[PDB]
């Protein structure tokens, strides 16, 4: 019975891990969007028809 | 998806190239007209019946 009761702490810990990963995935959404925009900037800046102000 | 989104920069660059060539073709209209008039001047000046003032 004491062993079954200690599984509540195991469940709390696993739920804590799922919450931590959820926050990481939200930040990762932000970061992959930023990286896509950054690739769009670098791709545009490699064109040589740009003037200096656009670059 | 990030690859599809970066095609917008490719399209911007190709449109920029079409604009650059358009300006060159407008200047080329001017220049071919000038060269035709210049050939008309040289052709008239090669006639030896011209007096010095007309030449």
What whole-number distance in Å separates Cα of residue B50 and Cα of residue B52?
Answer: 7
CB contact under 8 A, A49 and B13: yes
What whole-number distance in Å separates Cα of residue B10 and Cα of residue B14?
Answer: 6
What whole-number distance in Å separates Cα of residue A6 and Cα of residue B46?
Answer: 112
Phi, psi dihedrals of residue B49, rounded to the nearest 5°? -80, -10
Q: Within chain B, what is the greatest distance between any pair of CA atoms?
A: 76
Experimental method: cryo-EM
Closest CB from B1, B6, B17 relative to A49:
B17
Give A-chain residues touching B9 at CB under 8 angstroms: 40, 43-44
Q: Could you tell me the resolution of this structure in angstroms? A: 2.1
Question: In b/e form, how buried is each residue of B22-40, taking b as 16+ CB within 10 angstroms?
Answer: eeeeeeeeeeeeeeeeeee
Pair of tokens at residue A41: 């900037």
Residues in CB range of B17: below 8 A, 6 or more apart: A49
Strand ranges, E, within chain B: none
């Amino acid at each position: 019975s004491a062993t079954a009761g200690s599984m509540n702490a195991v469940k709390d810990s696993l739920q804590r891990g799922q919450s931590t990963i959820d926050v990481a995935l939200a930040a990762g959404d932000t970061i992959t969007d930023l990286l896509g925009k950054m690739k769009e900037k670098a791709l545009a800046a490699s064109d040589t028809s740009l003037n200096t102000a656009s670059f």
